[PDB]
Amino acid sequence: ADARPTPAPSFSGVTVDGKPFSSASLKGKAYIVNFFATWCPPCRSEIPDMVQVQKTWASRGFTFVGIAVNEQLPNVKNYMKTQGIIYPVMMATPELIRAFNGYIDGGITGIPTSFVIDASGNVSGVIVGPRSKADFDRIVKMALG
Template sequence: MKKKNPGAKETKQGLTKKQRSYIYTGFFVGLILLLFVVNNTGSEPERGPYPPNYVPAAQQNSVMAPDFALPTTDGKTLKLSDLRGKIVILDFWATWCPPCRKGIPDLIDLKNKYGKKGLEIVGISVDTDTKNQVVPFMKEKGINYPVVYGNQSVYMQYGGIRAIPTTFVIDPHGKIVASYEGLVPKLAYENHIKKILGL
């Protein structure tokens, strides 16, 4: 007959105090890690269905930016080709995306600073269920550049848009000179603008 370890007191569930201690410790460590992840997601891009090693064709720099014609928030139509001759920043975003919201003041500042020098910024909203929140959000934040409503066709033209924000910098000839996934510093865009303008 097997002798019980006198130092291991069994609980009603058959677990020792030591085992229960391990379980509780693991639970609390897991909870702390979960809270850490939740509190630090604001600077990360919102991920889409594509794998991390997927490289969309439209994000390979120095290719022509696919043209599109999309409805604006004020009921008009915006064609990318109509902006030829300007530097264009295309920003795929949504009202519910924390890093998108965080980056919008930088885009507003860039439009204020370089708008008269040939910069245009186009926000492409990927909102679906929250589409009715786009215009109120624009007014609240003072967005000073056109915003259009995206669709599956333009998402696929630009490689599927696996994360937001996803941003493309397009030169006056219509070529993509840079692309970014996630929130990037305003200086990154400004460096491209200055290089194109020869400043």
């Protein structure tokens, strides 16, 4: 029997707040890539918990990365300001969507949909249901090893 890893994709770009982002920066780090929209109520419920979890783990080898789908730049930039989003967030591009589409049957068709990449660099799981603050905290602990 074999353990087939699922290497995370490479991706990069410019964030909504005008900063550089490269997945190269994430070598050896666990991270969760969150496809979201700020108008979507389950996203509005979960992103503040994500921001709190980011604060706990930012210097402990983990980060969220947000990719905003079905969105507009001024709306996402203002949500970042109002909610104090402190992890990288990019507007979706077709390339960013196709980078992750392959990990879920049907592709990404609901939001929020998030992908858990462990500190090994493998995609370990897909989140397509709500998660509590405490659930994200435990997921990060597990993903880090």
